[PDB]
Enzyme design. Structure first.
Site, PDB file in Angstrom:
ATOM      1  CD  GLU A 189      -3.391  -6.407   2.677  1.00  0.00           C
ATOM      2  OE1 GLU A 189      -4.361  -5.711   3.063  1.00  0.00           O
ATOM      3  OE2 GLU A 189      -2.219  -6.187   3.047  1.00  0.00           O
TER       4      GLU A 189
ATOM      5  CD  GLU B 110      -3.263  -1.076   1.763  1.00  0.00           C
ATOM      6  OE1 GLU B 110      -3.328  -0.373   2.795  1.00  0.00           O
ATOM      7  OE2 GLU B 110      -4.257  -1.658   1.275  1.00  0.00           O
TER       8      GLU B 110
END
Ligand code: NA
Lengths: 449, 436
Positions: B300, B184
């Protein structure tokens, strides 16, 4: 023979007119964001105003600004005030209550927004900082430092703003059709905005309330009776609650004639419009707007002041019901965003106007009870408790919902207006509750909720 | 003997050492508190649970902080421990993705990932910190990210060394599927340039940074695949400008896998309300797939009903995934409720051929799959859900035959020739699924 327009006065949570009637305001926003401000030929025309009268609107939130009022340091633009007054007078002559909104978006023209004059703010955006425009520019660091100057009064911006609004207040003094001054549109908390999440910012709201009090004192020093309209800080629009008027955390409200002026926007609708995100995300509008209304109820119980929804909709016909039904539930008035000048065609003849143009009690000689309007077929029902007043109850009848005319029934009172009248007038039989039904002649009509 | 092998990108496919196209379904094993635990080791029973349910991949968390806890110095002891965990997982048939994890840049912001020594910026005393995920709007945290993308004090250089040492360490371990370069990534002070429709200029900078890290990795381990995430404004529905000529360079590096996440904002704030975001995310994945011709793994994702959207769209594209909510020390099998009914699935782990369309009904266990046979040195292996067939399962194959035993956890299929092979698996008596 129109009822002469009067001042409106806050009595607890109601707005009452000079005849002792409880007033419900439905109308629009008309704001000029770009200099030159209110130029000749680009303001509301006689035709525009007839459209508003035709559809029974009785209020306009009219944009002004710090930049328009004081375009050079310490110098009031009196010529601008002449033009603004010209528009105000045109509206009030036709029965429109005018709310003067000290408008801004993204602080100033320096950020591609409007409101504050560039001379009054030191901060400027750098060539490198991305500017996504409205509404994301609120996240620009330079714009945030701009707001810090305002709330800190670091270079006297609030002092100058007080002078500007004081001059405006002075110029409109004595005009009964001016319903108030709204002190600042969508106030951003500046660099410490993250302290407002996830459950509001008590400390900032104390700073914010003190600043609004200061502006109120500046206004009232020039015009001691004009109502003032106070917005929540604009993190309200991201579901964060307001801490205004919440002793001992923030001071109790000790100023008379203060009205709460929140906006009621659906986040996914706004993001669809300005970011182009999926429109189907508007499925969440109902629960999110319900939260806003729950927040409004909290202010109402806590402060016992009236509320007007000073902006909603923004062209999206799917979200309007959320504001309209919840507003009808509390007998709260509103101003739709937005109604522009120079209409070649009537913009209320489509999906938006079908819901905005309604049969509704503009003024009630009594305490409002439950009300309902069916925007599909025009069914209308209303109950209220009579009080002595010097004018009858006036109900505007939609010019869109009754093609074959309309019927009226009253229990506990009489209809004194003529068949097919634009305005239904009702006089109470006595002290007992009055019930009014208005509908298409072939409809069974609605019941009072 | 069919030991675990390396996986090699061949266009959109991941191909094993036997020439089979591989589909990966698995879990995350990422814990920021590992340094305080006696760390990230899964118990033998934790691994039993994964094996029993047919999962064949684990995203195993590491960090810059753990790899290089002092300036310019690698923790070889930590690498010994990490390697120990990798070996335990790969020995049981799990492809291990090594995830260079972070959240909120650093512990300095209440986050994890980058060691504090590597970042100059610090939050100020007055500065409000709302924690994850809104701390990404803190000026100091943004300035921290600016140090990374500008490499203003060599943090990217040091990260390259850290990831290079990790890569060196796992060289010659076939079960390692790759290194995921950064979890991220936040664009820092230019994040507003990514709205309302992406940031081609920042992604040019980000792409060059990922290439720099790739070079540092490949200099120590020249064949190890690398997994590149999109910048995390992806999670706010913004498209990626990775591999997007003319504005960012075309992909010229071998064995790069795209590693997006699939999350639903509406959920955080029962399925239908998440579809608009998820369809947008998946069309953004399609853009990347079409232009770059690289494989994608959803590294994810994870309300049980919202999972159904992700799983269906992943199946449509034959794209693998790693589910977020898994952890060490399971007292009970966490896949026996509603989430597991969706995650535990009959699926082709390895296909001796080009995958065609595939369908799995997670309510009744209906499964169908078609593929075009290719030359491979092992047969097609389909894992059969241990949850969906309480009375046993029936199998039928057209253009091929089943070679495994009745009731076996793996169905093995051998093609008759070059014609398409169709496999149906279902409850006895069910009319079964049909190939889309
Ligand atoms: Na203008």
């Amino acid at each position: 023979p129109a009822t002469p327009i009067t001042t409106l006065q806050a009595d607890g949570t109601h707005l009452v007119d000079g005849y002792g009637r409880t007033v419900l305001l439905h109308g629009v926003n008309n704001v000029d964001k770009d200099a030159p401000y209110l130029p000749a030929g680009e303001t509301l025309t006689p035709q525009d105003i007839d459209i508003l009268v035709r559809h029974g609107f009785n209020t306009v939130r009219l944009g002004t600004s710090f930049d328009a009022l004081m375009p050079q340091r310490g110098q009031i633009d009196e010529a601008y005030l002449d033009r603004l007054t010209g528009v105000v007078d045109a509206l009030t002559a036709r029965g429109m209550h005018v709310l003067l909104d000290n408008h801004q978006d993204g602080l100033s023209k320096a950020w591609g927004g409007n409101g504050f004059p560039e001379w009054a703010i030191e901060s400027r955006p750098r060539e490198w900082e991305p500017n996504p425009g409205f509404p994301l520019y609120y996240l620009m660091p330079s714009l945030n430092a701009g707001w810090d100057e305002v709330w800190g009064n670091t270079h006297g911006a609030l002092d100058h703003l007080g002078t500007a609004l004081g001059a405006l207040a002075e110029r409109v003094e004595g005009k009964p059709g001016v319903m108030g001054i709204e002190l600042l549109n969508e106030p951003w908390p500046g660099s410490r905005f993250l302290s407002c999440f996830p459950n509001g910012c008590p400390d900032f709201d104390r700073t914010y309330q003190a600043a609004m009090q200061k502006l109120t004192d500046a206004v009232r020093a020039q015009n001691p009776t004009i109502p003032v309209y106070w917005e929540p800080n604009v993190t309200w629009n991201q579901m964060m609650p307001s801490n205004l008027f919440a002793p001992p955390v923030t001071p109790a409200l000790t100023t008379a004639d203060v009205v709460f002026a929140p906006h009621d926007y659906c986040i996914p609708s706004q993001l669809a419009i300005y970011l182009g995100l999926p429109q189907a995300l508007r499925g969440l509008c109902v629960p999110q707007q319900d939260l806003t209304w729950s927040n409004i109820d909290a202010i109402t119980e806590r402060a016992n002041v009236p509320t007007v929804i000073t902006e909603f909709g923004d062209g999206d016909p799917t979200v309007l019901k959320n504001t309209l039904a919840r507003a009808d539930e509390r007998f709260i008035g509103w101003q739709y965003w937005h109604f522009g000048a120079g209409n070649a065609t009537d913009p209320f003849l489509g999906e938006v106007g079908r819901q905005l143009v309604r049969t509704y009690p503009q003024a009630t000689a009594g305490e409002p009870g439950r009300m309902i309007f069916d925007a599909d077929n025009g069914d209308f029902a209303y109950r209220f408790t009579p009080r002595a007043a010097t004018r009858p109850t006036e109900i505007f009848v939609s010019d869109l919902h009754y093609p074959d005319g309309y019927a009226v029934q009253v229990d506990g009172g009489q209809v004194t207006s003529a068949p097919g009248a634009r305005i239904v007038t009702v006089v109470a039989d006595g002290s007992g509750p009055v019930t009014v039904k208005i509908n298409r002649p072939g409809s069974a009509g609605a019941e009072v909720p």
